Every structure is written in C-alpha cells, then in structure tokens.
Design a protein around this ligand. Structure first.
Ligand code: T9F
Length: 182
C-alpha cells in the first residue's frame, strides 16, 4: 500500500523460505550466502525442509549474549545449491527503537501476509515461554500462532524476527549486523 510495505515485499520475495521442523512451519529469513535465521524454539536438527525439499543442516548455532542469556535467534547454514541475496547492509548496528514497522509472514497457512504494527520499543528483558530472553523488541499488535519467524522491517532496515506474543503485544528478537560477520 505504501513505501513500508514496498520494502517488506522486496525482502519477502527474494530473502525468505518456508522452513519446516518437527515443531512446525516457520517464516525463515536468508541473510547471505547459505546462512538464514529462525527462532530457537523451532528446534532445528541435522535435517530441515526448505520449501518442502529435504535439506541437510551444515551448522546451527542458538545465540546467547555475553551474560549467557537466550537471544531466541538460531543461525542456520543450509546445504543448498544457491545463495541468498546479501542483505547484511540493511541490518542495524545497535539496539534501538523504531517507528512505522511491518511484520511480514509467508507460510502454507499465511501466504503473502503483511501487518503494519506501528511503533517498536526496545523492550530488552522478557520472560519468553519461561526462558529469560534479552534484546526483545515489542509492538502493540495482537499477533497469533503461525507468525513466528515473521520478518520485522522499517523502510530500509531489517530489524528483527517475531518470536512470541501475549495476546495484546508481539515480541521480536533483534537482528544486529554483528551476528553475521564472516
Ligand atoms: C541456502 O539455501 C537457499 C538459498 C536461497 C533459496 C531461495 C530460493 C527461492 N527464492 C530465493 C531464496 C533457497 C535456499
């Protein structure tokens, strides 16, 4: 509908795949080369389905901060014959608040879904499903099951991936440029 949805659509059309684990279908963001991200609660194993194709996992790392606190991001390297468009220059360098964000989802159940979530707060600490979690972004939209892995963007920035909700608010794990240096 407008330039927010334009940037979101550009990311979804080239830099997302549908990931399936034993815990469900997730929106998965490809960041560069064969490296993608997914919420840690997806429980990635040695094998994952990517757009319904059986795919070997070459590496999977559940990130924690230097307090040894959960970040709810898993970085996955996929054994596939192609590379993602490099979108690392759209990642923020520092923790921040944002205006006018879009949450975008693409699964079998919710294809081509875009949600204007509005203002995003650097919330920080969250007890997420019983697990102390840091670097959480919060938005005042009543997000429901099926939206985990959803990409949070502003115009020109990919800022997070959706990891939970409380029925009234939705929560995303930050993406930082420093997670994807090689
Ligand atoms: C490293 O694994 C990859 C990389 C890219 C893809 C994509 C397929 C179609 N649309 C673009 C993204 C799939 C798997």
């Amino acid at each position: 509908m407008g330039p927010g949805f334009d940037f979101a659509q550009a990311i979804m059309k080239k830099n997302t795949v549908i990931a399936r684990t034993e815990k469900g279908e997730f929106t998965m963001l490809g960041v560069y080369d064969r490296v993608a991200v997914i919420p840690t609660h997806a429980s990635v194993g040695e094998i994952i389905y990517i757009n319904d194709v059986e795919t070997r996992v070459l590496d999977a790392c559940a990130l924690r901060d230097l307090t040894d606190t959960n970040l709810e991001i898993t970085i996955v390297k996929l054994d596939r014959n192609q590379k993602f468009r490099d979108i690392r220059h759209f990642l923020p360098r520092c923790e921040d608040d944002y205006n006018d964000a879009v949450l975008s989802v693409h699964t079998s159940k919710f294809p081509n879904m875009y949600i204007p979530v509005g203002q995003v707060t650097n919330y920080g600490f969250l007890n997420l499903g019983g697990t102390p979690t840091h670097r959480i972004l919060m938005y005042n939209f009543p997000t429901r099951a099926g939206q985990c892995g959803g990409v949070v963007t502003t115009t020109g920035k990919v800022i997070g991936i959706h990891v939970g909700g409380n029925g009234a608010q939705g929560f995303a794990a930050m993406l930082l440029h420093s997670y994807f240096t090689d």
